[PDB]
Design an enzyme around this catalytic site. Sequence first.
Site, mmCIF file in Angstrom:
data_model
loop_
_atom_site.group_PDB
_atom_site.id
_atom_site.type_symbol
_atom_site.label_atom_id
_atom_site.label_comp_id
_atom_site.label_asym_id
_atom_site.label_seq_id
_atom_site.Cartn_x
_atom_site.Cartn_y
_atom_site.Cartn_z
ATOM 1 N N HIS A 45 0.813 -1.227 0.000
ATOM 2 C CA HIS A 45 0.000 0.000 0.000
ATOM 3 C C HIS A 45 0.843 1.273 0.000
ATOM 4 C CE1 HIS A 45 0.073 -0.017 4.541
ATOM 5 N NE2 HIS A 45 -0.136 1.284 4.417
ATOM 6 N N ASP A 88 -0.476 -7.481 1.426
ATOM 7 C CA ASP A 88 0.124 -6.155 1.539
ATOM 8 C C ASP A 88 1.636 -6.211 1.787
ATOM 9 O OD1 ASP A 88 0.256 -3.406 1.672
ATOM 10 O OD2 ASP A 88 -0.479 -3.264 3.701
ATOM 11 N N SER A 180 3.302 2.522 8.504
ATOM 12 C CA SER A 180 3.080 1.522 7.450
ATOM 13 C C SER A 180 4.384 0.963 6.862
ATOM 14 C CB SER A 180 2.343 2.164 6.253
ATOM 15 O OG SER A 180 1.023 2.560 6.549
#
EC number: 3.4.21.49
Lengths: 230, 230, 230, 230
Positions: A45, A88, A180
């Site tokens: 992502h 992901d 992230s």
Amino acid sequence: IINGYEAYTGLFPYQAGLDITLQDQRRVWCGGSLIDNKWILTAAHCVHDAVSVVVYLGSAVQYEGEAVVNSERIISHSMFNPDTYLNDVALIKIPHVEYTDNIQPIRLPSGEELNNKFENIWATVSGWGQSNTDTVILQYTYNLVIDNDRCAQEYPPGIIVESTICGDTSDGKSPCFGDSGGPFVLSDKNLLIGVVSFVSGAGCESGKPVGFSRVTSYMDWIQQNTGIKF
Amino acid sequence: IINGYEAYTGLFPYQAGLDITLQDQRRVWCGGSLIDNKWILTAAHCVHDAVSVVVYLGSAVQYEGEAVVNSERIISHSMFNPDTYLNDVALIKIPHVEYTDNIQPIRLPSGEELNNKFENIWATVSGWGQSNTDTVILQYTYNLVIDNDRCAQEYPPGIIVESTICGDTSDGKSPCFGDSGGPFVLSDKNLLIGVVSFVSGAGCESGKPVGFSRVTSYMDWIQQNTGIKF
Amino acid sequence: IINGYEAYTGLFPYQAGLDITLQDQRRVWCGGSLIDNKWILTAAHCVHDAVSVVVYLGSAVQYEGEAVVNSERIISHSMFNPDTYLNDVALIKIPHVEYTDNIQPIRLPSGEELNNKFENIWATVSGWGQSNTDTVILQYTYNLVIDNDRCAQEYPPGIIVESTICGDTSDGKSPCFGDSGGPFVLSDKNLLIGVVSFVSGAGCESGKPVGFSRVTSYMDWIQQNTGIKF
Amino acid sequence: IINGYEAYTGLFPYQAGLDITLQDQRRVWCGGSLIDNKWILTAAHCVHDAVSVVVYLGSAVQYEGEAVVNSERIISHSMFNPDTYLNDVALIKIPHVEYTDNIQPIRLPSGEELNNKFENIWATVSGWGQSNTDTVILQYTYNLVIDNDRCAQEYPPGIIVESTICGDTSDGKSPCFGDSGGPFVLSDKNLLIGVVSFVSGAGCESGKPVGFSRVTSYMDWIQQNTGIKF
């Protein structure tokens, strides 16, 4: 990281800082893990629509590093699903960086570790994402790994899958936006068990579990795409 | 800003720093302009897919401010075209902020100014975008406004339109990634004439013009959406 | 610990909590390090006049432990000087405690490590001493080891000697009252390099270095009094 | 307090919790009594060698308070004898605290009360001393006041003097280490008659009497040193 503590240079030598430029010209920040002299493991992502990435290694200070290199290639998982965060994971190929006292790889699971779910284990997550404070210093915290069954009930059906590993944030310490792609590590074993993937829609201070890409589920993909046998 | 000058607090009191959280959980940085006690004007490409924004006002240091406020609402231009950057404007409603020495609004064009193309005037652009230097201090530079015809020649056909205003960067001084949404101002008039919209496909160091949303082209939209008359 | 972070049970398995009753009937708290199944290493200033000690092991919560045992014998260094803190080390003999996941010994220096001064190395100090907060949870922080020459100028002449090892507290993170006798550890090597001995007369938030008993200087005394060859 | 009852906030509003820092840097706990807006009465053995004290008022939880104040001055009895516990009284001057529901002063004897020996009356003693239970809640119990003659028989000659008041602990309910300095009060009269001074050499669970400083014997000293008349 919300309610984290400050790291010093050399504490988390495998931590990578990623300054990402997207196809739409926006500038994004994500963390990553150094898994080899030429490879960074991060979240899809973060980079699925990236044009280029500046990789920072060897320093607790954001946008600083003992080694600062540019990505040569980005390999985002082909089956990444933006809507569910399924698959992901992504790899960033970088020019060979020599390991030093402040730049070291994190170990990936192998053998028996591949079948370990790591339930009820304390792991360390680190990054330069949003925090209650104003700091450019790398932060970290500890999150207890919970079982997928307990985690699955905290999200809409279908989000928590076998390839997801969750960390409990009921104590108010939690990864937050900007974290992230960062590493979720069993410090004792210097083992990477997860990649920060998603925070609850309720936010970073919701007390909801945080989802990570379960590294054991992606070891084949990693070895196949890096060509490295871990 | 590449090859720019270093600003300091109070120099550009209308400058807003935007820490943006996207729907995909990524953290993005953009600049903006304070146009009213409760409104920030920025680029649609920055926030069209945003869920929240932390607004920093009154400080030249990135992620610092005399006033740090959270967005209450985000209004992005409904006809924004991601592919061409057409209609690249957005508004961020914030809780009423009191003007101070370090926090002041920028004037928006009205009357005859609305018909001025501002060709061949030096305008000031500012932001915390890429600068080839690892600084957290706001940078700025002066770019000459060129006519759309001259600018269109440097971009693929159809990109430069009447609602686009371009700034020449042949001196090697240029806005870059992260400067998006920032103000393009006629210093002596304290007038906002453009919002940083796009850099050339050639990059920031190619001497190609940078595109901005021509503010005079969106004054009706701004008034319609803010319910304020200028 | 001032400005420390919370530990979880199992993070510092060698940490000992000491509830000490003195000859004058007062109740004192000090930390200690588990160096063997039957031995705790602490500071002489904590126990030189102790009558009995309740030792807590295996828990981050104060006054709790996976193993709670009473001291069998206290061996305070015979040449401990209360006025200068010279020779501030002591051993507490305890009934054999079996190592577990939360109770493990800390390693003592040997071989070459005996000649290492550990200058400019980040070490971890932990304890339940005074903190800015209200908590019964074990806290820890990191202090950089400084050279004795620099440390000596921060105290009156004669206090800083060869057998002293100092930690820098210029960042505001520091051991404080109640942390005495606690471990100062090179986490990477699971090595005990110091025992919290003294804080500056200026207090815990003075930014002055903290003095610790240099473990390498007491290895003979330790082996001779425990009869154990480390 | 061994075998005592659990108190709760507001029950003993005159109880002070003392976190004491000694000259030797050790951290000690003692109880005390609020006798005025700016004064705490406690035992000399607790603070004779103290440098500072954090005073907790208005809460039954240890290290918590509605008012947390630092000592401004400590006055320990100049004729205190550490060996015999003779003249075991001290005062801690604190910044003026306003009485509330949870913070109230205890009455001190005056007039005829000054001549009362209080023999054979049940008095209430309270504190956070050792309780054979790991609780942080204030405990209390009732001990019968016995005559000095009966008490002297249980201690080495010369320990029990006219300025000593004893409480019987034959029921197995007794003050213990850490209760030092605590109040011994006639509940129905809200009168302070003793300050916890010493436990028997036999320990807390021997049914031997506990010695207290007889408050009526120090009323002149208290008035002399506080400049307050009772």
